[PDB]
Design a protein around this ligand. Sequence first.
Ligand SMILES: Nc1ncnc2c1ncn2[C@@H]1O[C@H](COP(=O)(O)OP(=O)(O)OP(O)(O)=S)[C@@H](O)[C@H]1O
Lengths: 58, 686, 58, 58
Amino acid sequence: LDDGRLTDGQGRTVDFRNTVVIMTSNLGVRETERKSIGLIHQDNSTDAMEEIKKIFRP
Amino acid sequence: LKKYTIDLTERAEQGKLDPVIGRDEEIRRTIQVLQRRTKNNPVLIGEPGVGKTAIVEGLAQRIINGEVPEGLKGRRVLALDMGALVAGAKYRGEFEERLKGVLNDLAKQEGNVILFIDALHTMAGNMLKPALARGELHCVGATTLDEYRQYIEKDAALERRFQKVFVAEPSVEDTIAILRGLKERYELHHHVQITDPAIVAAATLSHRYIADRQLPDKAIDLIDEAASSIRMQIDSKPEELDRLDRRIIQLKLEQQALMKESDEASKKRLDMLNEELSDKERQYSELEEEWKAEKASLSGTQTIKAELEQAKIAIEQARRVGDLARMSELQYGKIPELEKQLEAATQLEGKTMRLLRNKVTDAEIAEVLARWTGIPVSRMMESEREKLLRMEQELHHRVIGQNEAVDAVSNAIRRSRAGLADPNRPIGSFLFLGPTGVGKTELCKALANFMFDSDEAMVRIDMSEFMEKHSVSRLVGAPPGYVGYEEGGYLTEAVRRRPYSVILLDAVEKAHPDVFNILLQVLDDGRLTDGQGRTVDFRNTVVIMTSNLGVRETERKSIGLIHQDNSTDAMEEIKKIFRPEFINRIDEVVVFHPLGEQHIASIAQIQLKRLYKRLEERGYEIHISDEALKLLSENGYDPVYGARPLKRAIQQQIENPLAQQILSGELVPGKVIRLEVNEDRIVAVQ
Amino acid sequence: AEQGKLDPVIGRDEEIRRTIQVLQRRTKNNPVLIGEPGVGKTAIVEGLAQRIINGEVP
Amino acid sequence: QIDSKPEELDRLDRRIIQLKLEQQALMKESDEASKKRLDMLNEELSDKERQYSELEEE
Ligand SMILES: Nc1ncnc2c1ncn2[C@@H]1O[C@H](COP(=O)(O)OP(=O)(O)OP(O)(O)=S)[C@@H](O)[C@H]1O
């Protein structure tokens, strides 16, 4: 995510400079079911960002 | 004895030895070990390049200069030659025929012969044991540290016999003394001269920088390679000579182009070409005549070099064998005459040698070394104090902004490199507050590129990175003796390219107080006992520690207001959350701020400089207005992250529509773009 | 190289003078060209040999 | 230490060998009149030969 490279086993890198890493996430489902509609979007950015802060890095 | 063994009486007597310099401790230890009644097979712990074979050459200068004690005199010491023992073996098994014949005659010799095994670690293994164990011979050895550690300790009678002696690589002034003792063979073998600061700077800087190679080995690479460079380029013809040689060969070929004519009155113009040919031939003849004049000085000094080395070998052999009239004959007589007209020969090269340079100085060492390494020579021409006082200028070449950071951090680096902190500290004891993406990695690249000379030099640590207690075992990899000798440590990789590091220790306050104590051991003592327990010198490591406490008020207090206000009321928060010991550790408190209005315009236009060059290759030139980039700015200025959705709103707001407008056919290349001012969504117009 | 069946070594003079300075050394005399291949190691040897046969060699 | 010779006979032996190697150089003299000075070196040299005889007898 910083480089588009991956320092693999022998000491080389892996060429990721022109491809895309993709990740479907199973966390913010019911939070999105709570924000829509009638609840503010940045509130779900807030507390969904909070459980991300329990489980991810920013 | 004879055909496959050689007496060192006649090898040290013949003098196949390079001169040695003051090798006292190891040779006297060799004497007292060789006077033990058993385990008198001393093994020298070291590698060649400290000159272990040369230490044996000097013990042979103490046999042949008579400087050995009463114990080791009278002994008739014959050396084995396995390279002679391979001779006469055709059918399979005659080398060990002649080898056990060596066991026959050195068996009957019964103690008369001390053995020296050149390259002991040639000496198999089950058959070297019974002759020594019965006592049939007497030898001396030498091998590598690691080879020795895998050599003695296991076997019973092998650690009974083979013996430890501390022999090491010297300090500065002793390697200086070795190069002084060897400039006899250097100068009088390599057609060169050597002065004292070349030896002092060679042994000193070679001692300091390269902790890899050996002393005086790498200085032997310098004097050997560079001295032959001086001899070789002295053999070459000078520069004005071959400038004029190219000009006369072009003028002769053009004269041949002028002689073959069809129209006479147009092609008989070559008279001025002929007189210019005569003048340039005269000048080239005079300059090559000067080259032969310097070769005449080198002719006389060449034959007096030959008779000179014959003269000092004559006075030393006169010291050795002892003819009476020949000693005083040479002493008052032949050799001081060659000393006086040797001085007249040094004045002969001191007045004849104009083009070719016989004397070797540090500049040719900077030639051979400047084409060895490849690091810029101006970085050695730089001093520390000058690149401390002129740091703001080159920091204002690349990086724009951060005035109190460059000035006050420059005060911390002038204090730190000046020594105005505790010298038991790392280099930069910092504390940085502010958001991410304002140039911290860019500051590591800029300082790394200036004083560390790299666009590749930064590793960064946020506290959520932390590869764990097991990870120090991961960079030592497997313990030694397991699988993984193919890689081992990737310590060898990330520390292959960068021995130093500039580290961006993010969010120091959000870490545990155990990281206030581990990082207190970082800021104190200039070294950290890590999770494994060993410690590595942080005194060659700037400990840059960054943080993200007060984001919003720092994003406000940037334009117009003084920044010492933000630093001091930041320290009103720092005093509460830290101990006063941490405030004692760091020198000053610097807080990074997001830049001002015209400098935010500098940030957006620098992020669009990629678009200027990516597009100026393809044939598009934007002249973006301040108002279209301003709609990029205020449509980018989200107070959440700072300038981090500013790139998202530049590339997403214009450039994805600008990729649709350029890549659709609306923007024709070869024409100057001005990003105009419509409604708030921005549309490029040709 | 005397029949002319080969190709010239053009430019890159720090490398050719580098190997020649390695050659002229007495102790540690012989060279090794070392790199990840495809930089012209035998072709740098051809830089030496073409410099020798051209007569412009020091 | 039992098998060798002590220190003061080494010091006196080196200074006597040095002065008699100076004597071999000073017998073949260039100017016999201006070089009369070595008479004290001859008398003190004979004194060192007497002391050398005593110490070597010991
Ligand atoms: N700098 C260069 N100069 C000339 N040719 C080069 C260069 N770099 C790569 N090449 C090409 O790459 C090849 C590799 O160079 P070589 O002359 O074969 O040196 P090499 O690495 O010793 O290869 P060998 O002989 O198989 S070990 C050359 O034959 C050229 O086709």
